[PDB]
Amino acid sequence: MSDEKKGGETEHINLKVLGQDNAVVQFKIKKHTPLRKLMNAYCDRAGLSMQVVRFRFDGQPINENDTPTSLEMEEGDTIEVYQQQTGG
User: Fold this and answer.
1) CATH for 1-88, among 1.10.10.10, 1.10.357.10, 3.10.20.90, 2.40.10.10?
2) CA-to-CA distance for 12 and 1, rounded, in angstroms?
């Protein structure tokens, strides 16, 4: 309903984001779009710096330019966050 907004957008993939600690969250994005307008958007809406929020995909670094339609796993990301300490 109003407090949730669960009705819109067709061709999308879900991402599962795993914290090193115990925090797990999951996000939604179109396969076409680059990651930056999801990433910095959540960084602002949470209110934090990317310099402490250390992410890795396949145990390796990743960038904003690589669209997931260049990657093609279909869906289901399992990207990790190696956090600083308490904060999320």
Assistant:
1) 3.10.20.90
2) 20
